[PDB]
C-alpha cells in the first residue's frame, strides 16, 4: 500500500504536469483570439487539452 | 500608395505569419523589402511628377 501510495502520487505528479502543460496552452492560446495569431480551432483544442 | 498601406499591414501579417512561423524570415525581408521598394515608387514617383 506504500507502493501503490507514492505511484499514486507519482501519476498525481503527472496529471499535473499535462494539466500544467494544458493550462498554458490554453492561456497562450486565448490571449490572442479573433486576430491573425491564434483563431477558435487551436484554441478549443488547447481547451481539449 | 495602397501598395505602400497593402504592403505596410502585409508586412506586419508577416510579422503575424513569422510570429507564428508559417512564413520564414525571408518572406519578412520580401514585405520589408517591396515595402522600400514602394517607398521609393511613391516618393521617386513624386519626383517623376
Known sequence: ???????????????????????????????????????????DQALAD | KQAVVSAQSSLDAMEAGYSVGTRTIVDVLDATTTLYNAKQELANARYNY
Not at chain 1, 499535473?16 to 484554441?43: D, F, M, P, W
Open chain 1, 1 to 43: 500500500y506504500q507502493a501503490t501510495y507514492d505511484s499514486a502520487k507519482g501519476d498525481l505528479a503527472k496529471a499535473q504536469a499535462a494539466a500544467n502543460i494544458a493550462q498554458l496552452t490554453v492561456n497562450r492560446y486565448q490571449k490572442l483570439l479573433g486576430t491573425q495569431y491564434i483563431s477558435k480551432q487551436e484554441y
